[PDB]
Design a protein around this nucleic acid. Sequence first.
RNA 1: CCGAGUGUUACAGCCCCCCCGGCAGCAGCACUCGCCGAAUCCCGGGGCCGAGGGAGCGAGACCCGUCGCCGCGCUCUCCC
RNA 2: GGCGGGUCGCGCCGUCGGGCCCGGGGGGCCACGCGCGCGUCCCCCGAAGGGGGGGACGGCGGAGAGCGCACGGGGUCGGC
RNA 3: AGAACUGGCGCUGCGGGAUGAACCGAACGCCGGGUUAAGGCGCCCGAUGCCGACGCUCAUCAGACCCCAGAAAAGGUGUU
RNA 4: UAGCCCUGAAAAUGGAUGGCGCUGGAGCGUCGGGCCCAUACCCGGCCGUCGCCGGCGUCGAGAGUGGACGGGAGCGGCGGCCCGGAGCCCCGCGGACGCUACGCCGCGACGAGUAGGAGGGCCGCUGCGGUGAGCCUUGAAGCCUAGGGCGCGGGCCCGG
RNA 5: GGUUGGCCUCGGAUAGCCGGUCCCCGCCGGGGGUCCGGUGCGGAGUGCCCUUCGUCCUGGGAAACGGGGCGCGGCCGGAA
Lengths: 51, 236
Amino acid sequence: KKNPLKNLRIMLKLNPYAKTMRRNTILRQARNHKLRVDKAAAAAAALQAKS
Amino acid sequence: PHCSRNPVLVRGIGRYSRSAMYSRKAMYKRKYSAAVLATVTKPVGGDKNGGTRVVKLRKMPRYYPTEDVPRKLLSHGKKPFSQHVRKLRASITPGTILIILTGRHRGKRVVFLKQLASGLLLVTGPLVLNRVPLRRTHQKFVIATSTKIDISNVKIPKHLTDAYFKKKKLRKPRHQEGEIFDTEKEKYEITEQRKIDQKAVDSQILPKIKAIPQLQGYLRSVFALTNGIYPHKLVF
RNA sequence: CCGAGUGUUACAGCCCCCCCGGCAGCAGCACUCGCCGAAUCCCGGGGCCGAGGGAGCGAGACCCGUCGCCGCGCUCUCCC
RNA sequence: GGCGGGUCGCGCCGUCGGGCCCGGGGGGCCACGCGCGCGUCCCCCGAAGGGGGGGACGGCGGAGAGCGCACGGGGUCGGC
RNA sequence: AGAACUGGCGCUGCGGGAUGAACCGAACGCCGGGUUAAGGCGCCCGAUGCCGACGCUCAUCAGACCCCAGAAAAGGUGUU
RNA sequence: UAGCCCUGAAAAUGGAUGGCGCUGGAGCGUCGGGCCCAUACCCGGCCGUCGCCGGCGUCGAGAGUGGACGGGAGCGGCGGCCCGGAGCCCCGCGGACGCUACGCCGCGACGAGUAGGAGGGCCGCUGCGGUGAGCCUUGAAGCCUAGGGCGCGGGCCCGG
RNA sequence: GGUUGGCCUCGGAUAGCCGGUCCCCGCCGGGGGUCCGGUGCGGAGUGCCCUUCGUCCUGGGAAACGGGGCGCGGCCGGAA
Ligand SMILES: [Mg+2]
């Protein structure tokens, strides 16, 4: 018995939806890593250009 | 013979879905339905003997062994040695100064060039400083030292590979006679060729070593832990 | 006269406390709020110990099952 | 003159709920024979009681040939 | 000395209680890894060799972990 | 009034926080993070017992969870000059192991034990009926053994 | 069995060490100004050999002791 949640495609033998549950939650914590660091620099470059 | 058209983001996961790979592959217009020799005869070549001979070779074997093992269960490919993967560490770039540990040299600081097609990263201290030829070393028995040399564009020859750094022995005799196997009184004479080809690469590292001043004494020196030197208070 | 250290009383003439009307952009954040947490959650590493145990429904296989399930990409149309 | 109890409508609430709908004016989706008629619903049209499109169907009107790989895949091998 | 309920030793190791039938954990094929229980972490003795936190207490008989192996009435400007 | 320490407070070999010791704690009281181990728990291996089984399909010709033929109507897919059709294998004569059925083979769970009861024993000693075309002076029984093994063990075998 | 050795203040901790005039013990060491340093840098979390591959060929900086030793012999120093 290989452990689910430690190798993939044992999750997908038993819960086939849990691959597309995962590449929704690797996009949306990459595009919201984009959304922060772009905006966290946007108040950091605006404060920089004042000086 | 096309590209991936579904580029990876996590190992074994495509970025594009199952239905979005029903648009990108253009599968909505290529759905389809469309629909010996053992040998030959060989001539006789004889008298009173026609009707050339049988389609027959590689016959039933001359001897079966008395006991037979059962064949394996396969399970998975668990692929062989020459087909795994090559993994550097994060702290080793071409030009990162090393420390040899497991070898005969044991602390001779050397200059890393390239990580080969085998796994063993190729290295040389320049022979005018160390006593290191183009010997291979294992990846995890060296220590990356955080100073670097600039060999970003130097050269590396096409010819040298795993078949260039190996060893040779072959059994011609099979008799317990007082020679040492017939080649083991013998220092190896393959140095006829590497003497030329080291200066094919040693004549271009020395303009890159001697830019920074103290460096040629740093390679000529060796390494030691004596008194207050502990290797968890040492940023290698 | 300057500075200090006591002591006297006094409410902006250091400041604090509480109301009455607000912006900036707010992160459980400049390691104090460390809260309680995951369908509202996942990635990458190193470290240790082990590696026990004739699957071909097909071609009448053929030297020797790189096989079943599961997720796959590629060709059986083209263009760039 | 006041409460609690059963209920009617009223706006005001929530990332409400029904995939809802309904008509018009980037992201996601295990979501695929144009050729026509088999049942529902909608859009319209001049009608006034039928033509024509859309959508979809748990049903018919249309609607097999397997090719080679890579694999976190039925308890490790090395063609180190 | 005699009982009631239930557990336990007898028949039973092991960890802990310095030592022990019966306490506290916990029940046993032979083993390799990991983790905890009761307990402990100056050194015998594995582990606090934490910059552990807050207060109390000085004995000319200090005090120091269930069963458990030494104590009361009464008293003190000894100290909070 | 109540926390600590003191007085109260005496016992016979020399003596007990277990001891050495301990006083910005190694004491008392309330607490935190770490960290150490049982034959406890979890994963993995191996042995055995128990529970429900699996094969006499060696059927390389076997494959069935619907099977046959079979004539009266039409689908594609076969082979054209739009009508329509058996091939018992064969160019290889071929395809491991196994089912002591009282034997294998698979999964799964548990394992302590006196008194006591069973089952098993290819453990042993002495004799008898059978059986080994057994064994031996070219050396049996016995005994010894720093010799080599096996069995979990009762014990056994080989060398000297 | 080991893998370089440290060749030495006294003590203080509500305090301490450095360098330094005046007037004292046979030309040094003793008492006071004053000046530094101080979470110890005149700092055993420090220090010195050093991690010394060897050698040649050759040039710049440092150098007037040469330094091992069978030395040759002399000298006093240090008894807990
Ligand atoms: Mg008995």
